[PDB]
């Protein structure tokens, strides 16, 4: 999920936007 | 720069990206 | 605590994140 | 500029995006 994507690896803006309301 | 977003920095990134709308990661405003 | 101010490396990372492949004025 | 908008004050995703390209 988002920790693996953005903390363990490096994520793009689109990947973080997937978690928004 | 550290490009990873962990801990408080991940919450802040979501505040920035999602704005006042909130998000599914944690129940912040 | 979560700091909603973006200073130093947190401002630089934030520009990487939001600009992406664009790069930015400080690249 | 960016320092006053985002470090001294709190800036939005759109304000930060104005420094792109």
Short mmCIF file of N, CA and C in Angstrom, two decimals:
data_model
loop_
_atom_site.label_atom_id
_atom_site.label_comp_id
_atom_site.label_asym_id
_atom_site.label_seq_id
_atom_site.Cartn_x
_atom_site.Cartn_y
_atom_site.Cartn_z
N UNK A 1 0.83 -1.22 0.00
CA UNK A 1 0.00 0.00 0.00
C UNK A 1 0.85 1.26 0.00
N UNK A 2 0.39 2.34 0.62
CA UNK A 2 1.05 3.63 0.45
C UNK A 2 2.44 3.71 1.15
N UNK A 3 2.60 3.04 2.27
CA UNK A 3 3.92 3.00 2.98
C UNK A 3 4.93 2.26 2.12
N UNK A 4 4.59 1.10 1.59
CA UNK A 4 5.53 0.41 0.66
C UNK A 4 5.87 1.26 -0.58
N UNK A 5 4.87 1.90 -1.14
CA UNK A 5 5.05 2.73 -2.32
C UNK A 5 5.86 4.04 -2.14
N UNK A 6 5.62 4.73 -1.05
CA UNK A 6 6.13 6.08 -0.82
C UNK A 6 7.18 6.18 0.26
N UNK A 7 7.16 5.28 1.24
CA UNK A 7 8.19 5.28 2.33
C UNK A 7 9.34 4.28 2.00
N UNK A 8 9.01 3.01 1.78
CA UNK A 8 10.01 2.02 1.43
C UNK A 8 10.65 2.32 0.04
N UNK A 9 9.76 2.54 -0.94
CA UNK A 9 10.19 3.01 -2.26
C UNK A 9 9.85 4.47 -2.39
N UNK A 10 10.05 5.00 -3.60
CA UNK A 10 9.71 6.39 -3.98
C UNK A 10 8.48 6.42 -4.89
N UNK A 11 7.48 7.23 -4.52
CA UNK A 11 6.21 7.27 -5.24
C UNK A 11 6.06 8.62 -5.95
N UNK A 12 5.21 8.56 -6.96
CA UNK A 12 4.84 9.73 -7.72
C UNK A 12 3.59 10.38 -7.12
N UNK A 13 3.34 11.61 -7.57
CA UNK A 13 2.17 12.36 -7.18
C UNK A 13 0.84 11.58 -7.43
N UNK A 14 0.71 10.94 -8.59
CA UNK A 14 -0.49 10.17 -8.93
C UNK A 14 -0.73 9.09 -7.89
N UNK A 15 0.34 8.38 -7.47
CA UNK A 15 0.18 7.33 -6.43
C UNK A 15 -0.32 7.84 -5.11
N UNK A 16 0.14 9.01 -4.66
CA UNK A 16 -0.43 9.60 -3.46
C UNK A 16 -1.83 10.10 -3.60
N UNK A 17 -2.16 10.72 -4.75
CA UNK A 17 -3.51 11.13 -5.09
C UNK A 17 -4.53 9.97 -5.05
N UNK A 18 -4.13 8.73 -5.37
CA UNK A 18 -5.02 7.54 -5.19
C UNK A 18 -5.62 7.38 -3.79
N UNK A 19 -4.96 7.98 -2.77
CA UNK A 19 -5.41 7.91 -1.37
C UNK A 19 -6.28 9.06 -0.93
N UNK A 20 -6.42 10.08 -1.75
CA UNK A 20 -7.20 11.20 -1.37
C UNK A 20 -8.70 10.91 -1.36
N UNK A 21 -9.43 11.74 -0.60
CA UNK A 21 -10.90 11.84 -0.69
C UNK A 21 -11.39 12.69 -1.85
N UNK B 1 18.45 15.20 -1.33
CA UNK B 1 17.31 15.20 -0.35
C UNK B 1 16.79 13.78 -0.21
N UNK B 2 16.35 13.38 0.98
CA UNK B 2 15.52 12.13 1.14
C UNK B 2 14.24 12.20 0.26
N UNK B 3 14.07 11.30 -0.70
CA UNK B 3 12.89 11.29 -1.55
C UNK B 3 11.80 10.38 -0.97
N UNK B 4 12.08 9.65 0.09
CA UNK B 4 11.09 8.77 0.73
C UNK B 4 10.23 9.62 1.67
N UNK B 5 9.00 9.21 1.86
CA UNK B 5 7.97 9.94 2.64
C UNK B 5 7.48 9.00 3.72
N UNK B 6 8.03 9.14 4.92
CA UNK B 6 7.75 8.20 5.99
C UNK B 6 7.24 8.98 7.18
N UNK B 7 6.46 8.32 8.03
CA UNK B 7 6.19 8.90 9.30
C UNK B 7 5.44 10.19 9.18
N UNK B 8 5.91 11.24 9.87
CA UNK B 8 5.17 12.49 9.88
C UNK B 8 5.20 13.10 8.47
N UNK B 9 6.19 12.72 7.68
CA UNK B 9 6.40 13.33 6.35
C UNK B 9 5.43 12.77 5.35
N UNK B 10 5.00 11.55 5.57
CA UNK B 10 3.97 10.92 4.75
C UNK B 10 2.61 11.59 5.05
N UNK B 11 2.27 11.80 6.33
CA UNK B 11 1.04 12.52 6.72
C UNK B 11 1.03 13.94 6.11
N UNK B 12 2.17 14.65 6.20
CA UNK B 12 2.27 16.01 5.65
C UNK B 12 2.08 16.00 4.10
N UNK B 13 2.70 15.06 3.41
CA UNK B 13 2.54 14.91 1.98
C UNK B 13 1.08 14.76 1.62
N UNK B 14 0.34 13.97 2.41
CA UNK B 14 -1.10 13.80 2.18
C UNK B 14 -1.88 15.08 2.48
N UNK B 15 -1.51 15.80 3.51
CA UNK B 15 -2.16 17.09 3.78
C UNK B 15 -1.98 18.01 2.56
N UNK B 16 -0.76 18.04 2.05
CA UNK B 16 -0.43 18.89 0.89
C UNK B 16 -1.20 18.46 -0.38
N UNK B 17 -1.12 17.18 -0.68
CA UNK B 17 -1.70 16.68 -1.91
C UNK B 17 -3.23 16.65 -1.90
N UNK B 18 -3.82 16.24 -0.78
CA UNK B 18 -5.26 16.05 -0.65
C UNK B 18 -5.94 17.30 -0.14
N UNK B 19 -5.18 18.27 0.38
CA UNK B 19 -5.81 19.53 0.76
C UNK B 19 -6.69 19.28 1.96
N UNK B 20 -7.73 20.11 2.07
CA UNK B 20 -8.66 20.00 3.19
C UNK B 20 -9.62 18.82 2.99
N UNK B 21 -9.55 18.11 1.87
CA UNK B 21 -10.51 17.04 1.56
C UNK B 21 -10.41 15.80 2.41
N UNK B 22 -9.23 15.55 2.98
CA UNK B 22 -8.97 14.33 3.74
C UNK B 22 -8.45 13.19 2.87
N UNK B 23 -8.30 12.01 3.47
CA UNK B 23 -7.75 10.89 2.77
C UNK B 23 -8.02 9.64 3.49
N UNK B 24 -7.81 8.54 2.77
CA UNK B 24 -8.04 7.16 3.30
C UNK B 24 -6.93 6.59 4.21
N UNK B 25 -5.74 7.21 4.27
CA UNK B 25 -4.64 6.71 5.10
C UNK B 25 -4.85 6.90 6.59
N UNK B 26 -5.35 8.06 6.98
CA UNK B 26 -5.55 8.33 8.40
C UNK B 26 -6.67 9.38 8.49
N UNK B 27 -7.43 9.40 9.61
CA UNK B 27 -8.59 10.27 9.66
C UNK B 27 -8.32 11.72 9.97
N UNK B 28 -7.25 12.31 9.47
CA UNK B 28 -7.00 13.76 9.62
C UNK B 28 -8.00 14.56 8.84
N UNK B 29 -8.01 15.89 9.09
CA UNK B 29 -8.85 16.80 8.26
C UNK B 29 -8.25 17.22 6.88
N UNK C 1 5.56 15.61 16.09
CA UNK C 1 4.32 16.20 15.47
C UNK C 1 4.46 16.38 13.94
N UNK C 2 3.34 16.57 13.26
CA UNK C 2 3.31 16.76 11.78
C UNK C 2 3.47 18.24 11.58
N UNK C 3 4.46 18.67 10.82
CA UNK C 3 4.63 20.12 10.59
C UNK C 3 4.03 20.41 9.21
N UNK C 4 3.06 21.31 9.12
CA UNK C 4 2.48 21.65 7.82
C UNK C 4 3.22 22.75 7.06
N UNK C 5 4.23 23.33 7.69
CA UNK C 5 5.17 24.20 7.02
C UNK C 5 6.21 23.35 6.34
N UNK C 6 6.52 23.75 5.10
CA UNK C 6 7.54 23.06 4.26
C UNK C 6 8.79 23.90 4.15
N UNK C 7 9.85 23.47 4.85
CA UNK C 7 11.12 24.21 4.93
C UNK C 7 12.27 23.18 4.64
N UNK C 8 13.35 23.70 4.09
CA UNK C 8 14.56 22.91 3.82
C UNK C 8 14.33 21.75 2.92
N UNK C 9 14.82 20.60 3.35
CA UNK C 9 14.75 19.41 2.53
C UNK C 9 13.28 18.99 2.31
N UNK C 10 12.35 19.37 3.22
CA UNK C 10 10.95 18.99 3.11
C UNK C 10 10.31 19.82 1.98
N UNK C 11 10.74 21.07 1.82
CA UNK C 11 10.29 21.89 0.68
C UNK C 11 10.86 21.37 -0.65
N UNK C 12 12.15 20.99 -0.63
CA UNK C 12 12.79 20.45 -1.82
C UNK C 12 12.09 19.14 -2.18
N UNK C 13 11.87 18.22 -1.23
CA UNK C 13 11.15 16.97 -1.58
C UNK C 13 9.74 17.23 -2.10
N UNK C 14 9.06 18.20 -1.51
CA UNK C 14 7.74 18.55 -1.97
C UNK C 14 7.70 19.05 -3.44
N UNK C 15 8.69 19.84 -3.84
CA UNK C 15 8.82 20.23 -5.24
C UNK C 15 9.08 18.99 -6.17
N UNK C 16 9.92 18.06 -5.75
CA UNK C 16 10.12 16.81 -6.51
C UNK C 16 8.82 16.07 -6.72
N UNK C 17 8.08 15.94 -5.63
CA UNK C 17 6.81 15.22 -5.64
C UNK C 17 5.81 15.89 -6.57
N UNK C 18 5.59 17.17 -6.42
CA UNK C 18 4.45 17.77 -7.10
C UNK C 18 4.82 18.05 -8.55
N UNK C 19 6.08 18.43 -8.81
CA UNK C 19 6.55 18.69 -10.20
C UNK C 19 6.91 17.47 -11.02
N UNK C 20 7.53 16.48 -10.40
CA UNK C 20 7.75 15.18 -11.05
C UNK C 20 8.77 15.37 -12.15
N UNK C 21 8.44 14.87 -13.32
CA UNK C 21 9.32 15.02 -14.50
C UNK C 21 9.51 16.46 -15.03
N UNK C 22 8.53 17.33 -14.73
CA UNK C 22 8.67 18.73 -15.05
C UNK C 22 9.96 19.36 -14.52
N UNK C 23 10.40 19.03 -13.33
CA UNK C 23 11.43 19.88 -12.75
C UNK C 23 10.80 21.26 -12.55
N UNK C 24 11.60 22.16 -12.03
CA UNK C 24 11.04 23.38 -11.50
C UNK C 24 12.04 24.50 -11.59
N UNK C 25 11.66 25.66 -11.09
CA UNK C 25 12.55 26.84 -11.19
C UNK C 25 13.91 26.68 -10.47
N UNK C 26 14.02 25.80 -9.47
CA UNK C 26 15.22 25.64 -8.65
C UNK C 26 16.12 24.40 -9.03
N UNK C 27 15.69 23.67 -10.07
CA UNK C 27 16.41 22.49 -10.63
C UNK C 27 17.81 22.92 -11.11
N UNK D 1 7.93 35.13 -2.04
CA UNK D 1 8.27 33.92 -2.78
C UNK D 1 7.96 32.59 -2.12
N UNK D 2 8.59 31.54 -2.65
CA UNK D 2 8.30 30.16 -2.13
C UNK D 2 8.55 30.02 -0.61
N UNK D 3 9.62 30.63 -0.10
CA UNK D 3 9.98 30.51 1.33
C UNK D 3 8.88 31.14 2.19
N UNK D 4 8.46 32.35 1.84
CA UNK D 4 7.40 32.99 2.62
C UNK D 4 6.10 32.26 2.44
N UNK D 5 5.78 31.77 1.22
CA UNK D 5 4.48 31.12 0.98
C UNK D 5 4.32 29.75 1.60
N UNK D 6 5.40 28.96 1.65
CA UNK D 6 5.34 27.56 2.00
C UNK D 6 6.05 27.20 3.33
N UNK D 7 7.06 27.96 3.70
CA UNK D 7 7.82 27.72 4.95
C UNK D 7 7.28 28.63 6.08
N UNK D 8 7.24 29.94 5.83
CA UNK D 8 6.73 30.89 6.87
C UNK D 8 5.21 30.69 7.10
N UNK D 9 4.46 30.70 5.99
CA UNK D 9 3.06 30.36 5.94
C UNK D 9 2.87 28.92 5.41
N UNK D 10 1.61 28.50 5.27
CA UNK D 10 1.24 27.19 4.74
C UNK D 10 0.74 27.40 3.30
N UNK D 11 1.35 26.68 2.37
CA UNK D 11 0.91 26.76 0.96
C UNK D 11 0.19 25.48 0.48
N UNK D 12 -0.63 25.69 -0.55
CA UNK D 12 -1.42 24.70 -1.24
C UNK D 12 -0.63 23.96 -2.32
N UNK D 13 -1.15 22.82 -2.72
CA UNK D 13 -0.62 22.06 -3.85
C UNK D 13 -0.52 22.99 -5.09
N UNK D 14 -1.59 23.74 -5.37
CA UNK D 14 -1.52 24.64 -6.53
C UNK D 14 -0.46 25.73 -6.43
N UNK D 15 -0.23 26.29 -5.24
CA UNK D 15 0.74 27.30 -5.10
C UNK D 15 2.11 26.68 -5.36
N UNK D 16 2.35 25.47 -4.84
CA UNK D 16 3.62 24.85 -5.10
C UNK D 16 3.84 24.50 -6.56
N UNK D 17 2.78 24.03 -7.21
CA UNK D 17 2.83 23.75 -8.63
C UNK D 17 3.17 24.99 -9.52
N UNK D 18 3.00 26.23 -9.04
CA UNK D 18 3.41 27.43 -9.77
C UNK D 18 4.94 27.59 -9.95
N UNK D 19 5.74 26.80 -9.21
CA UNK D 19 7.20 26.74 -9.34
C UNK D 19 7.61 25.60 -10.27
N UNK D 20 6.67 24.90 -10.89
CA UNK D 20 7.06 23.87 -11.83
C UNK D 20 7.27 24.37 -13.25
N UNK D 21 8.22 23.68 -13.90
CA UNK D 21 8.72 23.81 -15.28
C UNK D 21 9.89 24.74 -15.50
#
